[PDB]
Amino acid sequence: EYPTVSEIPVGEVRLYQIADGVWSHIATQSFDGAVYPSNGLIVRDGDELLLIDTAWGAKNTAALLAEIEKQIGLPVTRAVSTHFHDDRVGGVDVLRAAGVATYASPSTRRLAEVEGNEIPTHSLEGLSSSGDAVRFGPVELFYPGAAHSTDNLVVYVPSASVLYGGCAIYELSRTSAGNVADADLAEWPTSIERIQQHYPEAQFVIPGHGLPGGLDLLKHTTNVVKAHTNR
Ligand SMILES: O=C(N[C@H](c1ccccc1O)P(=O)(O)O)c1csc2ccccc12
Ligand SMILES: [Zn+2]
Ligand SMILES: [Zn+2]
Ligand SMILES: [Zn+2]
Q1: Overall domain count for the chain
Q2: By CB atoms within 10 Å of each CB, which of 118, 121, 157, 209 scores lowest?
Q3: Which one, of 144, 199, 212, lies nearest residue 172 by Cα?
Q4: Which domain holds residue 110?
Q5: What is the largest CA-CA distance in the chain?
Q6: For the sheet containing 76-80, what is the strand order?
Q7: Does residue 93 have an active-site annotation?
């Protein structure tokens, strides 16, 4: 049902309708001779769309916009990047060029700048302390605390009970931590517990990469992170 990394030619983007007015977007990026899948979110807000995260790169992000115009045909007026790494902000210049207002927390914008990555135009206030939540159009943005990165945000669509955890949440088939250079391994399980406490009603949980699931993805991620902690 859900597109897997094998079924998407590099450069092409798939959309997957999660619930009413909620899609994920799936793209792949070759990297070090391996191919990785990557997820973002699209949320309908009246007759406009809110975009969550780029499709990992200029060419992928351009194809994302073209696929949205093709299948949904509503304008992407705003976009939020959930942390500063290239798979979340790579392509922000393309969004900006297309007239999309791009947003991130000031923590994310700063870290993107230090990394030399593309930098969202707008700063999201009210997200600087663990447990902070703000509404942003049809979603709630939540800062659970440092985890995959110190700045990661998670996104919840209350109308559809969809939780988008970004790269702070692992898919079930990932049993080892992979890249954690910018992570807070010490705070990560506590941050995940805050997600569980704040969204106990979530019906669908979308990880930053790979297959969606339920709230079981959270304790699975904690297990992976604690195992890596004890490596
Ligand atoms: O895509 C993965 N890493 C993301 C990433 C990698 C390189 C540069 C920027 C960037 O953003 P990330 O660290 O930001 O999540 C990833 C690492 S192992 C694995 C296994 C399955 C699917 C994906 C991955
Ligand atoms: Zn990352
Ligand atoms: Zn603006
Ligand atoms: Zn990622």
Answers
A1: 1
A2: 121
A3: 212
A4: 1-231
A5: 49
A6: 14-19, 22-31, 34-45, 48-52, 76-80, 101-104, 122-123
A7: no
